[PDB]
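the three lines:
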Amino acid sequence: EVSSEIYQWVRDELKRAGISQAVFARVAFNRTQGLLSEILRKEEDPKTASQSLLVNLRAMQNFLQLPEAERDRIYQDERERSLR
DNA sequence: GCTAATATATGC
DNA sequence: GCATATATTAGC
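prediction for all of em together
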């Protein structure tokens, strides 16, 4: 399942890696910036969260479990990718 | 449920 | 004020 701390963990990660919502939204759960923004604003309790949300949150949780180094390379690649 | 567009906000 | 980032929400 998903932890109710996911929202804090995502906020913690954005700050740590100094990345934008767009970059994280794409690589972590394949969605756009505005969606992540709303997801973060609402901060819905995962226990009353729709299955669509749960899919997005679990995808974010799994991505955060990757090694720090791997997540950093992935962010960098996405930056260059959109840079084009 | 989302994306894409764009009004606002933020870091220099 | 330029370059990006984030908040909003119309249209699919």
